[PDB]
Curated annotation (Swiss-Prot), chain A:
Domain characteristics, as noted in the entry: MVP 3 mediates interaction with PTEN. MVP 4 mediates interaction with PARP4.
Gene encoding the protein: Mvp
Entry function: Required for normal vault structure. Vaults are multi-subunit structures that may act as scaffolds for proteins involved in signal transduction. Vaults may also play a role in nucleo-cytoplasmic transport. Down-regulates IFNG-mediated STAT1 signaling and subsequent activation of JAK. Down-regulates SRC activity and signaling through MAP kinases.
Location of this chain's protein in the cell: Cytoplasm; Nucleus
Record's comment on post-translational modification: Phosphorylated on Tyr residues after EGF stimulation.
Quaternary context: The vault ribonucleoprotein particle is a huge (400 A x 670 A) cage structure of 12.9 MDa. It consists of a dimer of half-vaults, with each half-vault comprising 39 identical major vault protein (MVP) chains, PARP4 and one or more vault RNAs (vRNAs). Interacts with TEP1. Interacts with PTEN and activated MAPK1. The phosphorylated protein interacts with the SH2 domains of PTPN11 and SRC. Interacts with APEX1. May interact with ZNF540.
Name listed for the protein in its UniProt record: Major vault protein
């Protein structure tokens, strides 16, 4: 029982930390997409402003 | 981005403001002094009988 218990806990922490680390860096990805697509829209309509 | 373009729509609408303003303003001067001279050259009793 405890054998396949640690089996199951690791086996699910597997498909867990997978999507988890993917989430980490897809998130910091959108973080800099934010900082950037900011300066995109921020000055598109700064020239179009004028 | 939105701030700058719409603060400009501010200045542009200030412009379009003054355009419509003096548009109707001097159209008003037009028609008002039109009917001014109309009824003044008419005369009080003349227009009274005409109506």
């Amino acid at each position: 029982a405890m054998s396949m218990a640690v089996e199951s806990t690791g086996n699910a922490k597997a498909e867990a930390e997978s999507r988890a680390e993917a989430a980490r860096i897809e998130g910091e990805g959108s973080v800099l997409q934010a900082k950037l697509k900011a300066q995109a829209l921020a000055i598109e309509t700064e020239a179009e402003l004028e | 981005r939105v701030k700058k373009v719409r603060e400009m729509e501010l200045i542009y609408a200030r412009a379009q403001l003054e355009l419509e303003v003096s548009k109707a303003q001097q159209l008003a001067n037009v028609e008002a002094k039109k009917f001014k001279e109309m009824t003044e050259a008419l005369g009080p009793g003349t227009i009274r009988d005409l109506a």
